[PDB]
Each structure stands twice: as C-alpha cells, then as structure tokens.
C-alpha cells in the first residue's frame, strides 16, 4: 500500500498550534520548517517524479488583530498554478523510499520574477500538497496527498512574535 508520512510532524504541530506563517518575498524565501516526507509502497523498480503545490484553504483572507488570526476580507483571485518539481525527479521508487524526501529548496514568492518559485497571495492560508507522477505511464497515473499539519498563512512579514521566536528557536 502507498503511504506518504509527514516527517517532523511534532515540529509542524508546534507551529500549527500558533497558526503557522511563511514569509513570501520578491526573490523568494525557503520554508521553515521544510516539508519532508517518508514514502513506502511505491514499486521500487518504477520511475516517479515528485511535485509540490499549495492549495488555497479558504474562501477568505486572514488578518492578525489583537494577537488573533481572524477572517480579513474576500480572497484575491487564485495565485497562478505553480508546481515545484522535486530536483531528484525522475527517479526510481527505491530512491524515493530509501530516505526522507525533502523539498528544502522550494522558494515562496509574491512576485513572478522567475526560477522554480511558488507564487502565493499574502494573508491567504495554503495547504501543501505532494503529487507522485508515474513516468512513462500512458494513463499518466498521479497520486496526491495533502498535509494538514503543514497549513500556513503567507505573510510579507511575521505577524505573531511567537512565530518569529519559534523560527529563531528551531532554525
Ligand atoms: C524537537 C522537535 C520539535 C524538532 C526540533 C527540531 C528539528 C530539526 N529540524 C528543524 C527545521 C527543519 O526544517 C529541519 C530540522 C526537528 C524536530
């Protein structure tokens, strides 16, 4: 059976209990924590690509008011469909399963200024999603897992000083 488990789920959950925030910049910023997963139940002999995208969680944006995240207006039109291709792609099942798959190099941006970046809307909540694409497959079989522990609000600057302190503490 295919299983894709979140790595460092305890670390993610400590950010999630505060409401997680990820910085977006013109030139793009790496995530902390980094999304890493463990995989079992691929065909070790088959080749696959790993893709990462970010699904908009809500029909509204968010605002940080009096130390609280609250609904903060109607959402901006959906960010243009960005997919990050994991740099080990394509590769054998055995490769993806032997060690944690890390998306450490993906950069989150609020400006389409080129280079494997993901465009997000400030003050919107996203849920990371990983796709496993079977290579050479005439049925183009894809599998998709979502990681609710990894949900965050995209920000141009940290709102919650407690998130700022956690990012410093563990990073
Ligand atoms: C005690 C537990 C909560 C914990 C704390 C710190 C780590 C290490 N981790 C931090 C940042 C990641 O992007 C890579 C390494 C993992 C787990």
UniProtKB/Swiss-Prot annotation:
Subcellular location: Nucleus
Tissue specificity as recorded in UniProt: Detected in testis, but not in other, normal tissues. Detected in lung tumors (at protein level).
GO terms assigned for molecular function: DNA-binding transcription factor activity; DNA-binding transcription factor activity, RNA polymerase II-specific; RNA polymerase II cis-regulatory region sequence-specific DNA binding; RNA polymerase II-specific DNA-binding transcription factor binding; sequence-specific double-stranded DNA binding; transcription corepressor activity
DNA-binding stretch(es), residue numbering of this chain: 11-171
Principal place of residence: nucleus
Covalent S-S links between cysteines: none
Keyword Transcription: yes
Example GO BP: heart morphogenesis
GO cellular component: chromatin; nucleoplasm; nucleus
Subunit structure comment from the entry: Monomer.
Implicated disorder: Neural tube defects: Congenital malformations of the central nervous system and adjacent structures related to defective neural tube closure during the first trimester of pregnancy. Failure of neural tube closure can occur at any level of the embryonic axis. Common NTD forms include anencephaly, myelomeningocele and spina bifida, which result from the failure of fusion in the cranial and spinal region of the neural tube. NTDs have a multifactorial etiology encompassing both genetic and environmental components. Chordoma: Rare, clinically malignant tumors derived from notochordal remnants. They occur along the length of the spinal axis, predominantly in the sphenooccipital, vertebral and sacrococcygeal regions. They are characterized by slow growth, local destruction of bone, extension into adjacent soft tissues and rarely, distant metastatic spread.
Biological role: Involved in the transcriptional regulation of genes required for mesoderm formation and differentiation. Binds to a palindromic T site 5'-TTCACACCTAGGTGTGAA-3' DNA sequence and activates gene transcription when bound to such a site.
Protein name: T-box transcription factor T
Gene for this chain: TBXT
Shown residues within the full chain: 41 to 211 of 435
């Amino acid at each position: 059976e295919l299983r894709v488990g979140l790595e460092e789920s305890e670390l993610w959950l400590r950010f999630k209990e505060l409401t997680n925030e990820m910085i977006v910049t013109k030139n793009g910023r790496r995530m902390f924590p980094v999304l890493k997963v463990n995989v079992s139940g691929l065909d070790p002999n088959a080749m696959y690509s790993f893709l990462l995208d970010f699904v908009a969680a809500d029909n509204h944006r968010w605002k940080y008011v009096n130390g609280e995240w609250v609904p903060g207006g109607k959402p901006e039109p959906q960010a243009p469909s960005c997919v990050y291709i994991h740099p080990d792609s394509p590769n054998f099942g055995a490769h993806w399963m032997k060690a944690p798959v890390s998306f450490s190099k993906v950069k989150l941006t609020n400006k389409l200024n080129g280079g494997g970046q993901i465009m997000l809307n400030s003050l919107h909540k996203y849920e990371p999603r990983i796709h496993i694409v079977r290579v050479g497959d005439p049925q183009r079989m894809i599998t998709s897992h979502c990681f609710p522990e990894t949900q965050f609000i995209a920000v141009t600057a940290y709102q919650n000083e407690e998130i700022t302190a956690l990012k410093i503490k563990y990073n």
